[PDB]
Amino acid sequence: MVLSEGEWQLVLHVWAKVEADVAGHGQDILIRLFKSHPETLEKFDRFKHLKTEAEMKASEDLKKHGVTVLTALGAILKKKGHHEAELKPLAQSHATKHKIPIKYLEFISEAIIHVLHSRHPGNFGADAQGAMNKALELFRKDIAAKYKELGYQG
Ligand code: HEM
């Protein structure tokens, strides 16, 4: 798939808002993911023990990881489709070390959309959401293809 320049502009305009508070958005997105799909929390030996949202919010480790995740995703989005170099190491660790099925990447995509919808209604109308969805679908399609090449495609 290929996004138009207009679609990338919608994606990067809302991402610029997210970047005003990377740590806050990161906490919201990961907590939304762990609450909506508790099975995903099982993949994190570091966070598996967290029992409630209050505990998740108070974890400094979880917040730091959210910043690491959003910074990586942000670098990918900014390449506007030419993200092959960035995807390689991410695909390798998530397929071989962490063992993260494409289904889970769908769950976090849903979490990202929910959080942007709640915090940025003015910059995340229908057209903007469609563009963000398309960007994340592209991300998932390319990651899936790399998974296959790496021998996982899980
Ligand atoms: C937009 C989606 C994602 C991005 C950009 C992303 C990014 C990252 C980054 C940059 C790290 C650091 C280095 C590495 O190990 O590769 C990481 C680690 C990890 N990721 Fe992701 N990830 C994504 C989705 C997921 C999902 C959906 C799961 C699980 C449900 C997952 C599980 C993990 C685990 C288990 C680790 C290591 C945690 C630790 O250091 O203890 N990732 N991810």
Which of 48, 90, 107, 147 has the most ligand 1 atoms within 8 A of CB, as the residue to mutate?
90
DSSP class per residue in 13-81: HHHHHHGGGHHHHHHHHHHHHHHH-GGGGGG-TTTTT--SHHHHHH-HHHHHHHHHHHHHHHHHHTTTT
45 C-alpha vs ligand 1 centroid, how far in Å? 12
Which of 70, 100, 139 has the most ligand 1 atoms within 8 A of CB, as the residue to mutate?
100
Single-letter amino acid code for the residue at 63:
K
Q: How far apart are CA 100 and CA 97, in angstroms?
A: 9
Ligand 1 neighbourhood includes 77 CB (under 6 angstroms): no
Report whether 105 contacts 41 (CB < 8 A): no
96 C-alpha vs ligand 1 centroid, how far in Å? 12
Q: How far apart are CA 152 and CA 3, in angstroms?
A: 27
**Element at 3 (helix H, strand E):** none
Cα angle 9-15-19, degrees, rounded to a multiple of 5: 145
CA atoms within 13 A on the CB side of 141: 9
Residues 6+ apart with CB under 8 A from 37: 104, 107
120 is in an annotated binding site: no
Which of 65, 96, 98 has the most ligand 1 atoms within 8 A of CB, as the residue to mutate?
98
Report whether 48 contacts 42 (CB < 8 A): yes
Residue 151's SS3 state is coil
Question: What residue ranges define each of the domains in the chain, with the CATH number in brackets?
Answer: 1-154 (1.10.490.10)
Distance of CA 144 to the CA centre of its chain: 15
Cα angle 14-41-110, degrees, rounded to a multiple of 5: 30
State this model's resolution in angstroms: 1.8
Ligand 1 neighbourhood includes 96 CB (under 6 angstroms): no
Q: How far apart are CA 72 and CA 92, in angstroms?
A: 14
Nearest to 30 by CA among 18, 40, 45: 40
Nearest to 41 by CA among 124, 125, 102, 107: 107
Dihedral sign, Cα of residue 22, residue 28, residue 29, residue 30: positive
Experimental method: X-ray
2 in the Ramachandran plot: left (φ > 0), alpha (ψ -120 to 50) or beta? beta
Ligand 1 neighbourhood includes 102 CB (under 6 angstroms): no
